[PDB]
Structure formats: structure tokens, C-alpha cells
Amino acid sequence: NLAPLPPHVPEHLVFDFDMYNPSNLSAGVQEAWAVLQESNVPDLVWTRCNGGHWIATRGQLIREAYEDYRHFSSECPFIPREAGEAYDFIPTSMDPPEQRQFRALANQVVGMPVVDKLENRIQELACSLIESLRPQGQCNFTEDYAEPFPIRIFMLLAGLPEEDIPHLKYLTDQMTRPDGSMTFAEAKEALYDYLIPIIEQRRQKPGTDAISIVANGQVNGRPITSDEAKRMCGLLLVGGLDTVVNFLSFSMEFLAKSPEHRQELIERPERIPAACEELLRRFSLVADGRILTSDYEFHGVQLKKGDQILLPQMLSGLDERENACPMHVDFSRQKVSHTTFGHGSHLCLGQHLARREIIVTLKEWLTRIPDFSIAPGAQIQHKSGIVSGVQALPLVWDPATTKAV
Ligand code: HEM
């Protein structure tokens, strides 16, 4: 279902990519998107899928568009338009200078000092989950670790019940990897129905949890309103449930196929941090965009006011003009260039949390289960969207090679 080409779009600029169902998904998600960077594709294309939008395909362009909030506005950051329209998360749906106050608050909750404080729990849960899997010789990494690990840590931080997971997760998924089961507005609404009561409760009887801090926070000298906290929390929620979760599966699928990368990390542990960055580059997974605030000519292409453009954070570090041999994982690169956690005034506040969770998982997994692989005859399937994922990841290992700690 391609939408009629608008009048201002040169036919030569057309490239019908479907961000929800790219063509060589079988090959891997990062690989399917990378088709955008082939010599035959102009740097800035127009796709007729999902109602029609621009896509920047190169690091240089994505970064410029990200810096440029005057022209490229966060008001409508999701594609399709209905989604972008219904999107009202804070701070993500705001441009500077407005964004800055809400960002300051979100930081109080997810920032550096919070991670430092939660560090021992993170390590505690990782080790527990792994040790529990270890003797089994087999898991579903996605359902067995990648989901529980990050989510339980978040539920804790947010002071929310683990029983709510199933429900919240379904709604979060609907927003990034739409299923057809519900529209974006419906999904946002159900999440909002959830939060409202909880925020109410915490405005009256404050805790020390994330939600309590948000609901009682100060923005621009005055007190945050209720709709405002609702909208911040809604974002924290998607960040908590949907990001780290997917990333670990990409990375673990990779480790499962690369004995030499595993070994490298085992003998030369000082490399984990470097390795983590390299995986964040190669297994980048978020794609959102911006809306034109006006007609603007960008790299000789005429953008019209109201046009949405997808600026795939995922594409930046996959760009050969940025990283030599991009599809190849090399823990010893002189420079790992990516925009995995975004660029401009919107940089991930939760990046520090995300990194700690990754680094712990690698260290702790490898310590106990040094040798593992993909289950024989399992076909790993990727999923595309705003946040890309792995459907399921069946692993196998010989318990005799594991190490209890
Ligand atoms: C692998 C992990 C993650 C990735 C790749 C990721 C990626 C990103 C991206 C690309 C953006 C910018 C979006 C835009 O410019 O439209 C963003 C923003 C945001 N992320 Fe994440 N994220 C991750 C984990 C987290 C976590 C764990 C949290 C918190 C629980 C979180 C919270 C946020 C917040 C609060 C913002 C908005 C910041 C602002 O507007 O200033 N993310 N993230």
C-alpha cells in the first residue's frame, strides 16, 4: 500500500522502504535497513510506504537533522503520522528551550547517580538469573533473561508490581512494533489509564521511587502538572521495557555465533567497555524522525512544511563513510562512531543505565557460561519498527562446561 507521490518529490528520489517490514529481514534487521546505504540509493530518499516520508541514509545527514531542531521538530517524531500525532511523551515531543526543564527532571530519576546507587542490585539480579539458567543447558534467552533482567530492574526503580509486566509489555510493544491489534492512540490510552491512578496516589503519598519523584517534581520554578507526569512516565516506561531488552538479544545472538569474540572478552576483560560500544554500533536498533516546521532545502532536496523524515539512529554507525567495514564486529576499532542513543538535545538519559546492564550481562554471562550456541535448527527472526527486536532466541550449552560462582 504505497501512497500517491506528492507533487514536490522527484521521481528519482523514490525508494519504497517499509520501516515495519523491510525486504531482506531474513538476513537480519540491521542488514535489511543497510540496503538504504548501497551505492544505488541517494542520501535522502522518499518512500511511499506508511503514507510517505523522507529517510536520511547517512551519518552526516542524520546528525545535522538532529542538531537542527528549528527545521526538524520533535513534535511528531513517529511514523506513521497518526502515531506521531498521538505521540505526546515528554521530553521527546518537545524542542528546546521547552524540552530542557523536563529533561532536567527525567535525569534526576534515570541519571548517573541513580545507576551508581542501583549497581549492586543490577549485579545481584544478573548473577541470580544466570546461575538459575546455568544447569539447564538451554533457555529462551529472550523470555528467560533479556526480558526479566532489564524489566525487573526498572519495576524496582519505578516501584511498580512485577505482576503488571505482561500487560505493560504488550502495550509497549504495540507502540514500537505495531501488530495491527490496536492503533497507537488506543495503546497510548491504555498505558495512560494504567498510570493515572498511580500518579494520583503518589502525588498524595510520595515515595522514593521514580514515579513519585516525577509526580512531585518542579519544572520552571513551578510544580509539574498531572498530565505532564503522566507523559514523562509513559516514556520512561517504553524506555524501561522495550530498549535494553531488545539490544541484549541482538548481542547474545551474535555472541552465540562468535566463539572468538567470546574468548576475546574472557581473556582480556579490560575490553568489555570497548566491546560494549562496538556492539551498540553494530546492533543499533532505534529509528525515529522529525517533522518539517517549514519548507527548507536540505542537501539540495526541497523539504515541504509538514513532511516527516525518518532519521534512523541505527544507520549512522553502519555507514561506511563513518566506520570502515561496518557489518564486521571489531572490539579493537580506533574509533566507534554511532548515534545509537541519539544526537542533539534529545540524547538518551537512560544510556548510563543501559550500558551498566549490558556490561554486567556480558561479564557475568561469560563467567558462568563461556561456551554456548544457537539451538540446532532454530531460525532466529528479527522484527522491525521504531525499536527493532528478536522474536525468540533458543540457546543450548553443555552444563559440564559451565562454572558456578
Ligand atoms: C539500548 C538502550 C537504549 C537505546 C538504544 C535508546 C535510544 C534512545 C534514542 C535513540 C533516543 C532519542 C530519540 C529522539 O531523539 O527522538 C532516546 C531518548 C530517551 N531515552 Fe532511550 N534508549 C535506550 C535505553 C533507555 C532507558 C533504559 C531509558 C530509561 C529507563 C531511556 C530513556 C530515554 C529518555 C528519558 C529519553 C529522552 C531524552 C530527552 O528527550 O532529552 N532509554 N533513547
Side-chain angles (χ1 to χ4, degrees):
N1 182 293
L2 283 66
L5 190 69
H8 65 301
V9 172
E11 297 180 48
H12 61 271
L13 291 177
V14 181
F15 191 96
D16 301 312
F17 184 79
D18 186 357
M19 66 167 290
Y20 298 99
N21 184 225
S23 277
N24 52 281
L25 189 64
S26 317
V29 78
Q30 293 68 211
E31 300 74 358
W33 280 74
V35 302
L36 293 175
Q37 303 161 133
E38 298 290 24
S39 66
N40 61 125
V41 193
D43 291 352
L44 181 62
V45 306
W46 176 279
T47 167
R48 277 178 294 166
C49 302
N50 297 125
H53 54 98
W54 300 101
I55 313 179
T57 61
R58 303 288 163 169
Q60 179 175 230
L61 284 76
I62 299 162
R63 290 182 180 58
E64 284 183 23
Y66 284 133
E67 298 184 28
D68 197 9
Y69 63 84
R70 230 98 59 177
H71 294 106
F72 304 95
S73 167
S74 290
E75 166 205 298
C76 194
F78 284 29
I79 297 183
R81 193 171 294 280
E82 313 70 67
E85 295 199 320
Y87 188 92
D88 62 2
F89 300 155
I90 298 180
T92 56
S93 74
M94 300 176 166
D95 292 307
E98 177 153 74
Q99 175 244 169
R100 180 190 149 291
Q101 280 280 6
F102 302 83
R103 177 178 177 78
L105 175 65
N107 202 36
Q108 284 179 28
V109 306
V110 300
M112 272 272 279
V114 164
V115 183
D116 285 349
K117 199 214 78 168
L118 282 167
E119 202 187 338
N120 292 150
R121 300 317 293 279
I122 288 162
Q123 166 105 20
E124 177 195 16
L125 180 47
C127 291
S128 172
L129 227 53
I130 297 159
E131 178 53 41
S132 173
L133 292 176
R134 187 192 61 70
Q136 292 173 2
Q138 78 196 115
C139 57
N140 183 196
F141 190 89
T142 66
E143 76 194 305
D144 300 339
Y145 183 92
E147 289 172 15
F149 175 63
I151 298 174
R152 283 194 208 165
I153 289 164
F154 177 79
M155 304 299 254
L156 192 93
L157 167 81
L160 297 182
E162 291 183 1
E163 306 81 78
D164 287 332
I165 301 175
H167 180 68
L168 281 180
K169 188 46 183 152
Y170 176 88
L171 293 177
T172 293
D173 281 18
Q174 294 302 318
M175 301 178 195
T176 60
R177 299 178 296 291
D179 171 66
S181 60
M182 57 202 284
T183 72
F184 179 94
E186 311 285 46
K188 179 189 65 165
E189 291 315 274
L191 183 74
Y192 286 172
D193 274 5
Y194 181 86
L195 296 175
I196 293 165
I198 300 182
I199 284 158
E200 293 184 33
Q201 202 175 90
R202 276 75 153 180
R203 319 201 71 176
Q204 308 177 77
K205 291 182 283 291
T208 55
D209 63 293
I211 293 180
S212 286
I213 306 178
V214 182
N216 293 113
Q218 291 282 97
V219 288
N220 192 247
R222 54 82 178 180
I224 201 163
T225 73
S226 189
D227 166 80
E228 296 173 351
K230 176 187 67 197
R231 298 187 301 145
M232 306 212 187
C233 292
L235 181 67
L236 292 192
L237 252 293
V238 189
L241 276 50
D242 207 45
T243 64
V244 179
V245 172
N246 295 297
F247 182 78
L248 297 171
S249 318
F250 289 114
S251 290
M252 198 82 354
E253 177 190 11
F254 176 68
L255 287 181
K257 284 146 48 170
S258 201
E260 313 72 12
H261 293 81
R262 275 193 308 247
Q263 252 315 105
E264 201 186 334
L265 296 184
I266 297 164
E267 24 189 336
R268 300 242 68 86
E270 62 288 8
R271 281 190 186 164
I272 297 188
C276 169
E277 275 328 278
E278 171 70 353
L279 300 165
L280 286 158
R281 181 189 80 63
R282 179 64 187 74
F283 306 102
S284 208
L285 77 162
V286 169
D288 80 342
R290 303 277 185 271
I291 189 170
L292 275 288
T293 61
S294 59
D295 297 359
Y296 175 55
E297 193 190 47
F298 183 60
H299 299 265
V301 185
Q302 251 273 354
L303 302 181
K304 287 218 174 164
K305 183 196 211 191
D307 283 351
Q308 277 186 288
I309 176 187
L310 186 75
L311 296 172
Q313 298 80 352
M314 174 203 316
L315 280 184
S316 298
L318 291 190
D319 189 348
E320 59 280 28
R321 307 176 193 184
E322 307 292 313
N323 302 284
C325 312
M327 304 300 275
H328 167 70
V329 175
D330 180 5
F331 306 151
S332 40
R333 294 182 187 273
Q334 295 308 149
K335 153 67 176 174
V336 177
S337 158
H338 57 66
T339 66
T340 288
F341 294 120
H343 188 81
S345 69
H346 293 277
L347 206 49
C348 220
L349 283 175
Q351 72 179 282
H352 313 285
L353 172 65
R355 285 205 187 67
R356 203 66 222 148
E357 301 192 331
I358 295 170
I359 286 171
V360 178
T361 301
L362 295 175
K363 197 188 156 283
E364 297 317 327
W365 190 282
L366 298 174
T367 297
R368 307 165 184 65
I369 322 175
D371 207 89
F372 59 109
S373 53
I374 304 181
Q379 287 196 177
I380 305 306
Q381 276 146 269
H382 306 170
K383 284 279 300 186
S384 191
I386 308 274
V387 185
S388 295
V390 174
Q391 196 136 124
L393 177 64
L395 309 175
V396 297
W397 61 91
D398 179 351
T401 62
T402 67
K403 285 185 177 175
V405 165

